[PDB]
Design a protein around this ligand. Structure first.
Ligand code: ZN
Ligand code: ZN
Ligand code: ZN
Ligand code: ZN
Ligand code: ZN
Ligand code: ZN
Ligand code: ZN
Ligand code: ZN
Lengths: 234, 234, 234, 234
């Protein structure tokens, strides 16, 4: 799969070019990356690359350098995640470590985007787009719905855990590791009950905050709720 | 149809790059524009873009910057005209205002090329190539032959009117507006008779000039004759 | 076939760009050349161009400028050779002069690569890849196996003759021209016997050298042996 | 096609022999040329060669050396034109340059015959016979009627242009280049209108001359009229 590694290197080159200030070369590199991905033949990556070309051209016209860099980084993370999923499935790796790797990659991307200056709503939306791409890729590999839902729930819960650590709620963090371990080991109903208790605690914290609720708490609430829904659907 | 607007912006970027002096980037941009147009799926635009790539590469090798700029501007005008035709047909706009817009765009392109330094024979040939592209595009939209011929005749007559204004024959200009109005309102036979009288007057002027006939008069003669043929075919 | 001449000019531009130091523009030019060749529709050239893009990107990442330049020059020579083969076959040119032209082009490429600093093993491998491409192209034109083998044997023998001239064995050179003339005139069995005698003389020279045999002598041995095999298969 | 080059060399030898004074050897050479052309297998050339043998024998009996030389030169030009047409069609050359070459060859033949002392009526008749041979040859190559008519019209117009230059009508010459360019570029109706205006101007010149009209003007009138008919039939 060296074509996809070449695509990843190109994407890094495109990020560096946008940083330098050459936007024509960045647009041409995006076209080259689209050609490479179409040569490989992954549909989700292909549509993401085409929309990336169009939207990055528009943003570079307007002057939104950070948004274009974020979109390129999101596509890069998506391609690397597809590579790692294929390597894990071929090598017969356990679903557990694949899910942990996906969560780690998503958290690293979120930390990068937070360092750049992108707001957390945009970060969450980019992460969910990547998660939908991951869902399609996993469904392509013939995996059943249970493991797909498990991986997605674990990744969402890892992002939520990073948010909780930022907020400073250590006990909820510990309960989150417990729930993640239960999801990974296959014990679904216990994890769902744990997630219900976590949701109640989060709502109590939000109600305590009152009118000055930080946006991270609301995003964490939404993330934990959708992770609980996925764990129920397992 | 934002893909075609992105293509138009690219074409503007290509013109600016040719002006600056970066010919490799211009060639690569032309390839990108061809990819965009093929993604959209308009056959005439696609063949025009491929021949544009080849011929602009050759001309930039030779050093004919103005000819390459003229070809890129012609493709840009053709793409914008296709966009406007699609918007007019979808919105149910009257054929009259569509024809007036097409004529205005062609006259603006001719004025631009005249300012650049391209001779009037090349300008006329480029305009007729654009007109053939317009004819194909209009036939694609399911329009009948009568309105297509009306639009084409009006555009040709607007170019001829600009030529007459340059020459300084005001009365022939006024007769030309009368004929254009008659064509636009649907009165075809009156317009054909008016065009016959205009052709006779133009031939009288040419015969008066003798051996020192400017080329604009001969080009105007040819344009009015072909417009009269189209009006007859309406 | 002006598309292939445009591709050749592009390849020259790519070599010049690699020499200057712009590797992004070189990568983009390689993508453009691949698009041109795919537009023309020659399968061997297409696969060679794709692998060239990938490998040149990798080498320019590593810093092997000379290897990338050699690969681009090999693709350029292959495209020019295809052009000349098509022109010769269409014009009904004799197989003799086509074979002489192919040999001259291969020798010029080898001299160029030797001047650059590429070792003779790499030069020979590149030449054999070009020869396999030539074999496929000739088989496409509907030529029978005898003339294809004759052309390939003549080209290999011309490369071997250049190697012998470098070594300084004039008599073996003269015998090689005699064998090449016999192959070109159609006399195959006499050429095979001459090649057997040449092979015996080369082995005698190698045995005389002992442990200090230059690599050119061994490469010449292999080349003459494969040329004799092709001449037998005629 | 080296047989036809041998035939051309023979025809040159025959012209030289007629110039020297050996008429028996010239008759025998004409028989040899007929045998060569029949070996090649071009019907028009074959019938032309047989009638050439008969008529040159008769003329050399009578003493009309110049007429026999003119007939041999006409056959030579016809054979060379067939060679060039075949080379152009095989090589995929554009119709434009083929037409220009045919016109140049016809003008050179006309200049040669004028230098010899043959009258312009005979020159025109020989040229039209060659043109009919060209029409048959082009129809043999599978070309459609439009390009055949275009080539024939361009050649006739080039002969007419030479006549106009001899007469000394520069403005009509310039209009003729304009019409030739329009025919070559494919714009037929504009060329027909231009030819109509040229015909009117030529008739005005003839009427101005009165009773002392040179024959070149009448031949030019006929040539331009037939070229206009061919351009209309395009
Ligand atoms: Zn672009
Ligand atoms: Zn509980
Ligand atoms: Zn290019
Ligand atoms: Zn009237
Ligand atoms: Zn690339
Ligand atoms: Zn022997
Ligand atoms: Zn005889
Ligand atoms: Zn006129």
């Amino acid at each position: 799969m060296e074509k996809l590694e070449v695509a990843v290197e190109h994407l890094k080159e495109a990020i560096e070019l946008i940083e330098k200030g050459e936007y024509v070369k960045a647009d041409l590199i995006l076209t080259d990356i689209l050609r490479l991905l179409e040569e490989e033949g992954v549909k989700s990556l292909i549509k993401q690359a085409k929309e990336l070309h169009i939207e990055v051209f528009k943003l570079l016209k307007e002057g939104e350098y950070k948004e274009a860099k974020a979109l390129v980084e999101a596509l890069r993370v998506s391609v690397e995640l597809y590579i790692l999923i294929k390597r894990g499935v071929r090598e017969g790796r356990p679903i557990e470590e694949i899910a942990r790797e996906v969560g780690r990659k998503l958290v690293e991307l979120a930390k990068r985007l937070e360092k750049e200056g992108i707001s957390w709503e945009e970060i969450i939306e980019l992460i969910e787009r990547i998660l939908e791409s991951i869902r399609e890729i996993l469904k392509e590999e013939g995996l059943p719905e249970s493991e797909i839902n498990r991986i997605l729930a674990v990744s969402i819960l890892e992002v939520a855990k990073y948010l909780l650590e930022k907020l400073g709620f250590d006990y909820l963090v510990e309960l989150l590791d417990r729930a993640i371990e239960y999801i990974l080991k296959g014990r679904s109903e216990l994890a769902v009950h744990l997630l219900d208790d976590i949701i109640r605690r989060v709502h109590e914290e939000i109600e305590r905050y009152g009118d000055d609720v930080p946006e991270e708490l609301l995003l964490l609430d939404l993330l934990v709720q959708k992770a609980r829904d996925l764990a129920a659907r397992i």
